[PDB]
Amino acid sequence: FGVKTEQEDVLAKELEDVNKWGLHVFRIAELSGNRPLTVIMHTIFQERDLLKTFKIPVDTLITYLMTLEDHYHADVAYHNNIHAADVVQSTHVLLSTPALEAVFTDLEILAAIFASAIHDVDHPGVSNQFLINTNSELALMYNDSSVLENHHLAVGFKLLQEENCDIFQNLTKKQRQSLRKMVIDIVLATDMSKHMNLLADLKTMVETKKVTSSGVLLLDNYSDRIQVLQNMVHCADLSNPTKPLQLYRQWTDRIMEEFFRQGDRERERGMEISPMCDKHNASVEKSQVGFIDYIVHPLWETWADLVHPDAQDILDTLEDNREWYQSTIP
């Protein structure tokens, strides 16, 4: 023909939800033959007209996206291509918030989306502390400093050098240096060791926020523009408890599989078992409530303040999910 297969048609219909919080991302993964990152990135690039704006050849974009997706580990339950696709799509929705309308440049939008796509690539499904404590090659290469996040960046960039993978081949050197610095600043900010300082800075910005042209955020220096993008992708990375419960519970099952497997590797090696990694001493419900109360709600309450009232429904879903997990603490 020159028309979609029936499986491609069902995928195209699910992808009509790409602009919505609560996309059926697991169904997209199944329908695309485990290509959720490639199909969601391609959809977003076409929707935001990024191929025309950045003169990206479409065969190059698809080759890079398949290569990138292939470097996510299919044997890792959480930190895989489905999580990458979810953070991309969640960033895409946050960038579209009315409070940020016409704030960011096309290059900043490309930086936030590309950062989201690469931000966990080649994740081995164990923590930075695990890699440091095992004397792993990755921890030695990065001198024990944001080990995974340094690695995700290095892999995401190095894959541009594979055959027909250089999606930035038509950008000027000035565009490429600006894009590269923003992408590095965003992915390094996904290290949970940076969370308390990012949140402190987001609160300072909400406290002294200016809303110029009568409605929309004023961000007039790199420090403030990159802090908003860093917090936005960090919000997307920590968005699972803000999603409809059927999605949240799938993410909880996956992160607990990954954590319990790390705890099994710690226990078999006689290491201290990391927080929430002991399947024999586990309180999944209590852990989700503590995670929401100490990390996710303080972040999303502050984001919701920055973009008030755009994120009210997201904060309400988070609060409903928190009450649901509390109510099932045995």
Ligand SMILES: COc1ccc(C2=NN(C3CCCCCC3)C(=O)C2(C)C)cc1OC1CCCC1
């Ligand atoms: C759906 O539940 C979760 C989704 C993502 C996370 C994460 N947050 N973190 C931090 C790390 C610092 C030490 C403490 C862990 C939190 C991460 O490193 C990742 C990205 C894996 C956590 C999620 O929930 C887990 C299971 C129970 C509560 C934390």
Ligand SMILES: [Mg+2]
């Ligand atoms: Mg990460």
Ligand SMILES: [Zn+2]
């Ligand atoms: Zn992540």
